[PDB]
Amino acid sequence: LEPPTVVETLRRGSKFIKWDEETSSRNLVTLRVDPNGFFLYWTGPNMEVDTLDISSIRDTRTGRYARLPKDPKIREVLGFLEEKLMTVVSGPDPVNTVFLNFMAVQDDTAKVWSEELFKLAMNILAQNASRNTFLRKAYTKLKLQVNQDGRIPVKNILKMFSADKKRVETALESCGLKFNRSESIRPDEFSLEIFERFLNKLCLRPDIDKILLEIGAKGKPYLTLEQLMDFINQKQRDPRLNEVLYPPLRPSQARLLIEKYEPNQQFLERDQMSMEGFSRYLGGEENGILPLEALDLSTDMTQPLSAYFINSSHNTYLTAGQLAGTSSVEMYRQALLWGCRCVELDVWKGRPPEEEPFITHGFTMTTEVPLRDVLEAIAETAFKTSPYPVILSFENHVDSAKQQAKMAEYCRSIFGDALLIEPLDKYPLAPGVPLPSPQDLMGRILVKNKKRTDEGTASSEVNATEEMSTLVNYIEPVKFKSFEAARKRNKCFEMSSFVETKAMEQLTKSPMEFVEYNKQQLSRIYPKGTRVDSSNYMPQLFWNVGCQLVALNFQTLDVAMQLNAGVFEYNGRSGYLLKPEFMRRPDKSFDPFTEVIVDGIVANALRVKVISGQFLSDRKVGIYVEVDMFGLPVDTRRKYRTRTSQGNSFNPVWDEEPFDFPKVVLPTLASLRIAAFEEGGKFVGHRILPVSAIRSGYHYVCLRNEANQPLCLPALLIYTEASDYIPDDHQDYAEALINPIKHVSLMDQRA
Template sequence: AKSPTLCKSHRAQDSFTRFISLDMRLLELMGENSEGKMVSIVHGSDLVNISFLNVVAMTEDEAKIWTEELFTLATNILSQNASRHTFLRKVFIIKQEFNDFGVHEKAFCSLLFALSLQLEGIKQDDFTWEAFQKFLDSLCFRPEIQSIFEECGSKKKPFISMDQLTDFINRRQRDSRLNEVLYPPLKKEQVRQIMEKYEKNTGQLERDQISLQGFSRYLEGEENTIVPPERLDIIDDMNQPLSHYFINSSHNTYLTVGQLTGLSSVEMYRQVLLTGCRCVELDCWKGRLPDEEPYITHGFTMTTEIPFKEVLEAIAESAFKASPYPVILSFENHVDSVKQQAKMAEYCRTIFGDALLIDPLEKYPLAPGYPLPSPHELQGKILIKNKKNHRHRPLSGSIRRREMGEQSSPNMGMQTKLGIYPLQGTAGSEVKATEEMSYLVNYIEPVKFKGFEVTSKRRKYFEMSSFVETKGMDILKSDPVDFVEYNKNQLSRIYPKGTRVDSSNFMPQIFWNIGCQMVALNFQTPDLPMQLNMGVFEYNGRSGYILKPEFMRRTDKHFDPFTENIVDGIVANTVKIRVVSGQFLSDKKVGVYVEVDLFGLPGDTKRKYRTKTSNGNSLDPVWNDDTFLFNKIVLPTLASLRIAVFEENGKFVGHRILPVSAIRPGYHYINLKNELNQPLLLPSLLVYTEAQDYIPNEHQGNSPSFLGIDIQVQTIEDLRQHKDYVKLIKKQKKELKELRAKNLKKVHTQADAYCIQLFTVEPHEPVQHQLNALDHELEKQTLQLKEGQMQELLKLRQELHIQEREKQHKLKQTANERYASQLKKLKETCEKEKKELQKILDRKRQNSISEARNREKDRTELELAQDRRKDKLISRQKEVLKHIDEELFPQVSKYAQ
């Protein structure tokens, strides 16, 4: 269902009147007050081609419950951005509960037939969720999953360990741009919970293992979506002035097709507001006799007319269903009748009631220098943008309670014809506002733009100007910096040029880059600019308000949107993406390809890539082409990636818009959406992404890759492998070898000399005397030899001790050098973490005391964590030095004592 609504509206009543007239028995069964029991469900593929399903409840309470629950389901942002696993589960439930795949069954059958695949039948009761998963596994052979599994360390085994899965998640799937203290890596206990969720084999769980099937389910799971789910919630600070936000805006909201012919529709206001749009346009014209009811149409064209009053009723009904934040009604007023303008003002007061903001807030008077109020302070309020006539004196608050029958004062000016203001790009010209209409205008007062110098002097921030896209482009080219400065305090609205008779759109990114808040588009045309608009405003809770980047809000910062340099205070990003494979992309046997586009600043690097076309395979194509590199994205918070799939003939299949600042690195499934940003259940892509801080080419050789990672203290074995230590050991071995050879040569020389002396003894001496003298001499020589060897050994040991001390000193020196280097890196890491935390705290700063305490607490916790890491490093260094002294060189320590 697209947008279920309460059925007390005129559309429900009219449709049910026709329906009930066919069956009087049903009318009798409903009884009195049947209008409150009617439920009208609106559904369709886009905002224009919609259908109505009308049902009747037995009681008003049941009708209310059904309406609220259906609306909640239809507008659930998390459900529309669910994981691949959840979408497959939806397909299975539809098959089980209704015994029908609906349109998907036809797609399945067509696809199987085209691929010449035949599968055996299965009983309905046997077709369980597990059987459905096996069916998908057998239908789509996934070699790329096996390759990823092997990357994790399976080595062709049917499982990986918990340690390997933990390493994969923290190394491949974690965003390195995140602060490690605020967003720590997953612990084993957390990884264990993931394994228990997706691994069905209890035996492997007991051994701390996960199978290929369990790993594949994890990749499809909600923990592994391409964008963190919290980014879909309201995460922006909604307490800043209105001028600090991009506002989802519509142009000629009432049109359903082109600008010259076709139907105008009240329903378009409901549907546009339900998408999260916060600014709609009303082209008002003077009604004819006898009713003299103002109507809305595109002037001087053949488009049909719709009653002004019915449009206001539709707006009142749907204004705050999708978002609680303020709605701006942009009036293009051509009603040149005082009486009918008074009627318009009265309709606004009576239909909107307290939701209509008439009196300015006390904190934000309509005076120079005062900022605009915030979306939070204007919750539930409707603001009128209409020309204002300042010649009238302010009216009293009693005007809000004026009865419809009262007539305006005859002194208010001309009774029938009023002066006009020329307005470029519109049908005809706007007329002057009457007193009643002027009194409804406060914070959105349109004025003619007279230049940036004039507006900066006036400092009336409640005044705003509208620019046709061509005029806006001229100012953008000539004064881009001044345009950014203007948009910091005042609102600007950009609308399509009049020659876009086919209701095509311009690219909104061009004017977002200079901070224009209300970039109005033709919502009835789901072209690429509208797709980008829908994708961008899906985030921040689909509130219709996106907080602009900080430098586009701070008055002390100046920004040139055409810059190619790094913006001061902003960390540029580098994004890499590789399209791995696709699943169920088309129900035809046709080739498909993928385009990846970057939308950001003009100074960003290459913007568009395309894969090869698959060879007639749309069921499970595998690309694994070269990685697409977006080397420098100057402003990540303002940039978006669009990943789109097309058939080989160029027919659109589906796409997804992703904010660069929120893209998760690693392997992820991307569930595709249609042109209107509605999810497609089956088509998806598996991609591998890398997102990191940008490092200029000239600095990449010195890039601190250690930043954001715990510094590991070097072990004894690591120190032994250090090149200086290895060089010293080789030198000592060489000297010891030379010393041994020298000593051995000396011993041989002495032995040879003794033998020569023995054989040269005088022959005339008595034999016994000679033998005795020989023994005595031998003992003497032996003693001398022993003493000499002992001296040599002592000398050798002394030299060896000196070398050991040199080795110990060198090892300590190496350890100290490594320690000093790591300590320096640790300090640099700590400083970067403090700066990152300070940036986060600055963005989230509040004026309250409690927020200040939380900030100090966060800083204290960070410093304590850094101190603990430093103490851990120092303690480990002491242990290394102690181990060197006591275990590796105990003899040296003993000798030194």
């Protein structure tokens, strides 16, 4: 994690011939990035600037990977080198992305611009930024987007806070600016101390005016050093942590918060923080809902491959329904650059005039993609965002002897070095020795294929030859027999892939044994062939028994894919999560369908109270907030949901009881989901937090859309109380352990 710095060739910009294919309009623009790393802006064809949001860039490819022009009028006007092209592909979902074809004019300022802009699109301190940063993004979007005369149009400010255009047309008249629906503000006269004041006359806040009556700021305007330091040590302080690992704040330490957040100099001169210095602090860089050591690549990455929730996909190539959609190669690049580590490939037998294998769902008339471009998509983009091993779940339907050699030479020449041909010398393919780690395979691409009708076409694939099976070393599928005849075989490299409605008869019949299978071997689970509209099963139903390769259709982002793209955002967007300790120790055994707390697993007790919201909707509607928790089946039985919005627009305030999830049995598996809607069912935003890392006290949740990219303006304000669990038989005999001296001083006094 680093702050997103902007290189000095990026700021002050370069000169790009920005072309297109639809309109086929070629233009010479100059590209700048603003000095915080927020927007990529360039002047238009009619002298108004445009702003690509950098935080919504999927990829920035260049060189021989970039989008070549097709129109012979535009191949001639660009000068056709091919090492200058730069394609900045952005978009909100992987299914409907929007390209942006540039072309450099100097010698190789495109390999620089396409790398120092991809490091700002994949920055874990920009996507997880504070709330006072997402209000300097909605301010840079107003300073940048000027009209022809070099001045912010007032028809743009009303088009930002577009719920009440009478509270926006009156806040502008109180700060002194022009407030006509056609007029224009000069950008020197819209400084950040004016936009901060303009947001204060807009949004009346009685949520943050109580947070100050509760901590004892009853009278005078200053909140002292002592009250603030008792606030950050007692309310905002996670009560599951050591008091020696993370020590509480000392007065030497809660005084660089005053010198960072205080605007006044007669208050900061002593040690007294004003109220505006407090409301600057609640959305500060410190007071975030998740700590910075929960998002960087910090898990133990050396345990065997059988002990990791690997991310997955099922029929990755389709962009639509499973029956008559359109299959494209781009859903290999957009899946893997999201944190996917198990793609599917349905390699089918090619035609007589050119024997070349292609990819389609079998016998359903979907369009076809060839294998040589699919493998060049997988090889290009695999280790761009996470250096951890990609598994290619082949489905060999090719019954031609002359084409298995073609698909072997394709795998051996396109991947080349990064294909795990030969087994590692440390972990041989012997009965008993386990699978490697993600660190013994950092940068290896492992094929998955056989060696020597709820499923659809997956149930009948051909027997492999000696030319394709020789790349299958560790991950190898084999026909399932039972569990007892797979635990006396004791081979920790073989696997067997389940369909969903036949793993639902092994998840319920024997879930004691189906964890202990997955402590040693792998398992892949793909949705059944009745879901012909590209819908998903819930993966946390199948992650309770520790199944790793849970395959999900990356097309339709329903609730299952808002989960599978929100819990694999942790571990540094690496696509590898670590199983909890009781599902990867071969001695400890436990039931996933349990109803009590497990002996050795510390429980927790969550209490989320949703207080208010900021700028949630773009129209005057009512807004409700759903709060769910996913986990073991004894944690998911609570799905709370607030009443609809009762406060004014730009700031709904809910008066709801705190939602108590009192007994989380395994809190290193459970994950909380806060999804704010509109009345009628429209999505607005959601955030998926884990329970084992979410802090306590009055925090800002900065909401995200359905693919977990940050929404700029919307946010909630919740109050969480994540403490430990103490059972009902002795909740006072865990008070005799915290303060034992006074407990015995009471016991001898009561004699």
